[PDB]
């Protein structure tokens, strides 16, 4: 048993009652779906390639909707805490369980990401991905910031939290701020 969050009666994986999420890492260089770069260009601000930022699965990104530009949850922050688990063959156990806060600045669409981001309802509606998680967080890794955490697709618990001050200030520059 590599996955430590066990499915509840509705199939949703949890760990001591808290909901779990799967995670992956990505590199693509795009500005992304919250507009965190210069208007009209596909160029991200450097901080949006360097900091702890995430592309959640589509139905969380837009709070049940399908908009892939200025989703409802752009600019939210989530605290992810490793459980020690992982999907066998698709991750590993991390060296510690320090929690890390990430800011939503992009989206992981269902199309082309069915295994991890193919979840057909928002959290709380008992819809899960193919590995049993109600939400997925794809972590930006342009500058190796996920490797610096030594995270290889860890299973995590997840919660929304207020953003740290520096990430709030960064988000103010994104086009979707106040949309």
Ligand X SMILES: OC[C@H]1O[C@@H](O[C@H]2[C@H](O)[C@@H](O)[C@H](O)O[C@@H]2CO)[C@H](O)[C@@H](O)[C@@H]1O
What phi, psi does 61 have (nearest 5°)?
-50, -45
Could you say whether residue 122 binds ligand X (CB under 6 A)? no
Per rule CB under 6 A, is residue 25 in the interface with ligand X? yes
Residue 3 interacts with ligand X (CB under 6 A): yes or no: no
Nearer of residues 58 and 167 to ligand X, judged by Cβ: 58
Residue number, 20 or 108, with CB nearest to ligand X: 108
Scan residues 49-88 and list those touching ligand X (CB under 6 A).
55, 68-69
- Give the residue carrying structure tokens 């060296």: 95
Q: Is 153 in the site for ligand X (CB under 6 A)?
A: yes
Answer yes or no whether residue 116 interacts with ligand X by CB under 6 A: yes
Q: Considering only 23-31, 71-79, 158-166, 170-178, which stretch makes contact with ligand X by CB under 6 A? A: 23-31
Query: Which positions ≥6 away from 134 have C-beta within 8 Å?
Result: 12, 13, 19, 20, 21, 119, 123, 124, 126, 127, 128
Interacting residue ranges for ligand X, rule: CB under 6 A: 24-26, 28, 30-33, 42, 55, 68-69, 90-91, 106-109, 113, 116-117, 138, 153
């Amino acid at each position: 048993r590599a996955q430590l969050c066990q499915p509840d009666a509705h199939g949703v994986r949890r760990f001591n009652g808290r909901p779990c999420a799967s995670t992956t890492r990505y590199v693509d260089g795009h500005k992304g779906a919250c507009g965190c770069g210069q208007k009209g260009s596909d160029t991200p601000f450097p901080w949006n390639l360097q900091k702890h930022v995430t592309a959640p699965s589509e139905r969380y990104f837009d709070d049940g909707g399908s908009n892939l530009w200025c989703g409802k949850n752009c600019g939210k922050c989530v605290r992810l805490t490793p459980t020690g688990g992982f999907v066998p063959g698709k991750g590993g156990a991390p060296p510690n369980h320090n929690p890390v806060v990430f800011m939503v600045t992009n989206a992981c669409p269902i199309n082309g990401n069915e295994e991890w981001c193919g979840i057909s309802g928002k959290p709380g509606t008992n819809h899960v991905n193919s590995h049993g998680y109600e939400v997925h967080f794809d972590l930006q890794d342009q500058v190796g910031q996920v490797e610096a955490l030594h995270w290889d697709n860890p299973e995590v618990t997840w919660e929304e939290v207020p953003c740290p001050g520096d990430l709030q200030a960064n988000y103010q520059q994104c086009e979707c701020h106040n949309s």
